[PDB]
Write a protein that binds this ligand. Sequence first.
Ligand code: FA5
Ligand code: MG
Length: 405
Amino acid sequence: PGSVVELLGKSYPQDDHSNLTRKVLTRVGRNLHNQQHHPLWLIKERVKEHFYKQYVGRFGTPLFSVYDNLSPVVTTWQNFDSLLIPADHPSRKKGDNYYLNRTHMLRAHTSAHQWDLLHAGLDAFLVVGDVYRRDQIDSQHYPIFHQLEAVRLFSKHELFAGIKDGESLQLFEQSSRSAHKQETHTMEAVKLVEFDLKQTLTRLMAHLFGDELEIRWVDCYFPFTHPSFEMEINFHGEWLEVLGCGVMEQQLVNSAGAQDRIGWAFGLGLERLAMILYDIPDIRLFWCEDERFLKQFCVSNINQKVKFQPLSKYPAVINDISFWLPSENYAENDFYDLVRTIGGDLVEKVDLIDKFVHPKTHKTSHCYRITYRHMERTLSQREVRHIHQALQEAAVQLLGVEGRF
Ligand SMILES: Nc1ncnc2c1ncn2[C@@H]1O[C@H](COP(=O)(O)OC(=O)[C@@H](N)Cc2ccccc2)[C@@H](O)[C@H]1O
Ligand SMILES: [Mg+2]
């Protein structure tokens, strides 16, 4: 805790919202997506190449300008309001975000840059960068990850260029919103935009994975797009979501200054995509510096297919930790941050297995099961005991929990 936070050369006063941890701080600026030979950098480059090739290959395809070095520090307005996210939306909870204060935060998604880039007059761009979220702990979640945003605008004439009387067709109208379109969009326009969005993503996936992947489109919701979809890839017998997308909400596009255009946007999870593409078992591997892992991604050309050889999996050490939550003062993700700070990448996952209220005291008891497993070696019972004891004491000091164990 403190009164002022210094980050990337700037100073931010603290308030009731401030909840950034020093641990997260050490990762800001690391930019793995810009680190030559890093798997995330690799994905980013192969995605860029795909878009370049399509630009040079099809007259219709616009040139996408790429922004992969935008500061992750943004305003709540950039991250939330510009995207039409309601003031009472659960995605704004202090429990799920790293707020520097009430006005600034570490972006929770690359969509935080849509409005600004649109406002600058760009028709097609990609944003690649580290995003931050407070979440649970397991092999598929990390406080920091990366996304790649894409935005593509269409003018009326351009969208209907391939149709005879196309110029008599329109992008906008004044009807009602349905499951298939916004209230100011015509179905003619939406059908073409949606088709372009899905075809583009399908071609990008074919380029990255080959024409053998099994994908499916799932209808979903986002305040900033409509209709909206999630694309899922069937991997290891399970359908996994790898991206969100949809037709951009017109209110957003209009407020940025492009009131004469209609467009689509998407945001893909790079780690999610990389773990499927290279069969990487644990997200923590992206942050280790073990050459056994990293050396495998140093290719001659980004098109050199890397055959990822999984590292050995070492034994885990499991310990439980129980304590009484402070009298009406505590958050699950708060404990998760403390674990990331003390246990670092030694912890594989934390599971809240039990919770109950004591009648006499009125206090709530929480019991978490902590799985300790190092991605690079075998952990000794000894070093785990010490890390675990430090977690217990810290929990009592910072979280205000009462050691129940
Ligand atoms: N910690 C994590 N590490 C890796 N992948 C994660 C993590 N948390 C979630 N994911 C995966 O990321 C996919 C989505 O991220 P969400 O954060 O869920 O969506 C978004 O972040 C939206 N901004 C996407 C978007 C952009 C533009 C237009 C429309 C929609 C999820 O389906 C999920 O499987
Ligand atoms: Mg998504």
